[PDB]
Ligand binder design. Structure first.
Ligand SMILES: N[C@@H](Cc1ccc(O)cc1)C(=O)O
Ligand SMILES: N[C@@H](Cc1ccc(O)cc1)C(=O)O
Ligand SMILES: N[C@@H](Cc1ccc(O)cc1)C(=O)O
Ligand SMILES: N[C@@H](Cc1ccc(O)cc1)C(=O)O
Ligand SMILES: N[C@@H](Cc1ccc(O)cc1)C(=O)O
Ligand SMILES: N[C@@H](Cc1ccc(O)cc1)C(=O)O
Lengths: 74, 74, 74, 79, 79, 79
């Protein structure tokens, strides 16, 4: 469950333009991001995970702030 | 040849705003992206590869959709 | 010091839209990016590092060009 | 606390443990290896010389004379 | 099919093979190591305890009593 | 020049060196392991079979019969 992953891994959410930024604990980004990819959300154009940072690309016309609010809401 | 790399590695292309998103098979993103970097395309501001996802940043005024169409066309 | 890291690691800076792109020597991206993260700059929404490429997301209304100019200026 | 945290990390991320020679091999779910390995590093195991995470695999190097197997067992007992 | 795919992977990604002790070391082109290693994991080699990919290098741990060299040879013969 | 560059790399990135068996283990600051390891690869050490970088850790495999320790010492002497 993404909801469960998000309580353990989502340290914070931020945004700018079409991107939602998710912060995780150290090394957490690929574990969280690949789980997002498996959910298969239509508004999620794609994700890239660094070490502690995920960039999630929102499908126009959704903004990165809206997208990040939906992930933070879970 | 990028054309050849793209038939073996490009599972799909997507976009939003100034970003083209390329999906690859598992672990394929850095192999595909670094090969894009070596091509040296003026409209490609840069790329970042995750595991199975490449973000390619299009130079304004080109959009991520146009850029992704040119890569998908190869 | 970020200033010192930037002379050793910043090969070039580029931009498009809300993103500043930093190029590093091979494998340098996570070393440079995590150091940016530790600085904690309010306009930096987040960073993701690939191998030789950092994407830095600028907080609206700052552009990726302005942000990249401030990093290049250090 | 650190121990309760390690135990929960291991329970949620450690799919299996294996070994060969002085290496213990941890398997995780997809993307999980840096998350798990980062934390292991942070607990400060004297018997661990170091770790490297891939995507779903960690190699944990055992400090001589300990073996990869013994390392693995130590970790399994923390679950 | 899996074998034809492994063979093509190896032909296109394996620049060289080397070894030391219980480790086989695969070299790839730039960025190629996770692509190759992911696939190796997926073929299910019983003689492989696990793999870790860097950027252009994979370490493949051989299951005791097999050696890194023997592993390498097995892989070379699949090309 | 390559040597002055290696020396500066090592001085700035090598927090510590350790070993077990045929592996030398390099510790770096955060994110530093691919930067350091890339460069090591590029200097062409005959005694190095290969390297893999994580985030803050590199495993350097020593070419038989050299040991992880001896490798480490060689690198320490370049600082
Ligand atoms: N936040 C960036 C930079 C980073 C890289 C390595 C780290 O250990 C920490 C941060 C990323 O996750 O890609
Ligand atoms: N698509 C993201 C997340 C991801 C990370 C690890 C994976 O194994 C799979 C997907 C990326 O490539 O960075
Ligand atoms: N520039 C991209 C692609 C890349 C990946 C692996 C490399 O070795 C080089 C480049 C990134 O840094 O993610
Ligand atoms: N098991 C290897 C190879 C791998 C790479 C990428 C993957 O998505 C999956 C597996 C590692 O974790 O490095
Ligand atoms: N060979 C090592 C170090 C390396 C890191 C990044 C590179 O781009 C190249 C080499 C690895 O694959 O981890
Ligand atoms: N030391 C391990 C685990 C690790 C992963 C991510 C980190 O940010 C820190 C440590 C490695 O370098 O792979």
């Amino acid at each position: 469950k993404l909801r469960k992953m998000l309580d353990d891994l989502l340290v914070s959410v931020d945004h700018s333009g079409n991107i939602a930024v998710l912060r995780t604990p150290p090394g957490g980004a690929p574990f969280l991001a690949s789980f997002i990819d498996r959910v298969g959300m239509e508004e999620v154009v794609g994700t890239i995970a660094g070490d502690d940072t995920v960039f999630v690309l929102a499908r126009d016309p959704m903004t990165g702030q809206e997208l990040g609010e939906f992930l933070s809401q879970r």
